[PDB]
Design a protein around this ligand. Structure first.
Ligand code: DAO
Ligand code: DAO
Ligand code: NH4
Lengths: 405, 405
């Protein structure tokens, strides 16, 4: 069937507002985590986060941004970048039935859902709520707020799957190409950063709380003293395009998506089973006869999660353990946006020939012994890379990207 | 490619807690709309809704329901019904890599999102919030909360697209079968009903507010005196299965999904363009050699929406107009769950050979000129039915179902 390639990327993350800033951060192992007075003032135990360092004010037309929440704003800016990077003119992707968009978020906008409820209970009621809360709070906000302004005429919807969200968006975009239904599909996601959402994770003990005095060291995937993930926000978008279509217009191709896995654990609501991830990676590797040169793990920096994933990796590769690094150690967990941002970090490593370090490992977990966990920036000619995304509800997604000749 | 059929269904709506109660309501043209003290007390102008009349207490095991919000609860009950109706047992669908689930909601859980923030802001903080809010508030709540307890091992994620949500879930399930990736996929969705979410629509002016004294007459699609939709809650689930697999086990087949359309308006954020709807219906009709006998339109019961759809239908069919009925006139708008519930209402009409009536039409709109709008339960031998679902962000979905030869 049809082949799908990535011809453009865009990103707004805690470690950079474009692919160049991100490239630099990755090579330097630079942390994007900072102290958050907002989280502390909210009464949380976790006082750190991967915030987007950028004032989005005035970057989007007023009549457009009025319907958007932060998730949508980050994704929108990422898409603008992706379009430019892919070299697509308005006439090339706009008002085109064969051009679609699949992008989502993990929780829509808790901030605006809370805003509406707070306003409604106030002295003004409906007048305080305003007529723009629905498009900001609905789960499809990220896709609705981008499809409309970018004049998308093809597929238009969001895939939501907790922390695997934007990973499934990319995979579904590949499926549209494979089914011959679309020539181009913009795929990615976004996630806002706020105490309204973060506190829920702290209430279940999922966030790091013992490193508030040293923010850049809180996220420490694979470290014996890890104590939870560091929440983050941001966005990402990639241009998934049919191969022949990309070649015909002389598009720059980062890589082909040669493998996409999507499975379910059918076990625990918030803890990974490991068994599902094994099937997910194996599914993504079906027909891929080239070895995996680098694996961008889920590496949440949680006690149980990091362990279950290393076990799954051992089962899949055994004595064929590939190089591994967890970028979340420096970026934090952007939840719904993690999938696309991590695929982008992987594409950058593949494009520039290097492996980003898995930082903050002062004492390697005993269950990670024997694995090839890269802890220092290492230059290397990569050809095939893998990126895993796992979320609550036992949802698993894996993407395999490979350079073209 | 492979063919997909519906071998089972389950539903929990304002007009019935199962397919029998729904069938009884559709035949009688009974309304599920009632006066809501909750909405009135919140300060809203709309005082009516299509609530689920069912005491869900004790219907789901304690350990499982503790992670669920109302949208998940409704979808869960619908899935239990669908499994039994399909004649499937644990040994056949559990722990099976070729059995998946695609189901979502329009906005996760505004109630628990607000509950979390309210609790956190209280003197107890994190202790008051509890450790179960994430799975209740996240957008993928519906898929996560069903795939886990039902031990699903295949595909697992939610698709969100506002009022087209559950319609795209079904379409995506069909795609999994066509790609040969799954033999069975449970598809559908659910949506909670609460002022927290309802007030956002009211502040938007999208809800009916001139018939609070006569609830059952508030939702009046195509009526010249319509003034917005009536919000509703509920769930729905259908079993999408590969044809040979279904025939091999001697399953009961309601109909085959012979058409699926998914397009984008790329125009207005909250108003339909019509142009997108035309392309969507045409896409679903492509290849169908049989004419459309019945059409379960979107019929939101809104001034602009109704007009735009009628025009689109007129553009697609023209003189050869099929029987048209807007079930939302009696059920209300269940948003994220509207797609699957309407697909179900249509399957029941096709299964029981009859057309549901479009109630509350005291004065037909000028736009519905040369169109066959059924306003009374009519017995007919339907063969091919169509259902349209449109949502904010200009997202369109259309499903075409036909009896198996
Ligand atoms: C990743 O799997 C962890 C869960 C992320 C879900 C997306 C964010 C939902 C938060 C909603 C408010 C509690
Ligand atoms: C249908 O298109 C109208 C919009 C429905 C959006 C999904 C329902 C939830 C909206 C946000 C609630 C906080
Ligand atoms: N990853």
């Amino acid at each position: 069937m049809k082949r799908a390639v990535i011809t453009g990327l865009g990103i707004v993350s805690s470690i950079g507002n474009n692919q160049q800033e991100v490239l630099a951060s990755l090579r330097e192992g630079r942390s994007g985590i900072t102290f958050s007075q907002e989280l502390k003032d909210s009464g949380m135990r976790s006082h750190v986060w991967g915030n987007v360092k950028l004032d989005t004010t005035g970057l989007i037309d007023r009549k457009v941004v009025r319907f958007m929440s932060d998730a949508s704003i980050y994704a929108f800016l990422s898409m603008e970048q992706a379009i430019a990077d892919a070299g697509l003119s308005p006439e090339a992707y706009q008002n085109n039935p064969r051009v679609g968009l699949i992008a989502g978020s993990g929780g829509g906008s808790p901030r605006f859902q809370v805003f509406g409820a707070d306003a409604m209970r106030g002295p003004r009621g409906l007048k305080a709520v305003g007529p723009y809360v629905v498009t900001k709070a609905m789960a499809s906000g990220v896709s609705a707020c981008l499809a409309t302004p970018f004049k998308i005429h093809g597929v238009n919807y969001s895939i939501s799957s907790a922390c695997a969200t934007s990973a499934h968006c990319i995979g579904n975009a590949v499926e549209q190409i494979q089914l011959g239904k679309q020539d181009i599909v913009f795929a990615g996601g976004g996630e806002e950063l706020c105490w309204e959402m973060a506190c829920e994770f702290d209430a279940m003990g999922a966030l790091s709380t013992k490193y508030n005095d040293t923010p850049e060291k809180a996220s420490r995937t694979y470290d014996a003293h890890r104590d939870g993930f560091v929440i983050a926000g941001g966005g990402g978008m990639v241009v998934v395009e049919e191969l022949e279509h990309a070649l015909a217009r002389g598009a720059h191709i980062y890589a082909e998506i040669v493998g996409y896995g999507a499975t379910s654990d059918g076990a625990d609501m918030v803890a990974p089973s490991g068994e599902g991830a094994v099937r997910c990676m194996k599914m993504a590797m079906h027909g891929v006869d080239t070895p995996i040169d680098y694996l961008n793990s889920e590496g949440t920096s949680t006690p149980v999660g990091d362990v279950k994933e290393l076990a799954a990796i051992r089962e899949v590769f055994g004595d064929k353990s590939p190089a591994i690094s967890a970028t979340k150690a420096m970026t934090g967990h952007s939840l719904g946006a993690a999938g696309v941002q991590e695929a982008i970090y992987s594409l950058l490593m593949l494009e520039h020939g290097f492996i980003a370090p898995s930082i903050n490992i002062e004492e390697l977990d005993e269950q990670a012994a024997g694995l090839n966990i890269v802890t220092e920036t290492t230059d290397r000619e990569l050809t095939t890379v893998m990126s895993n995304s796992f979320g609550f509800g036992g949802t698993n997604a894996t993407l395999v990207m490979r350079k073209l000749k």
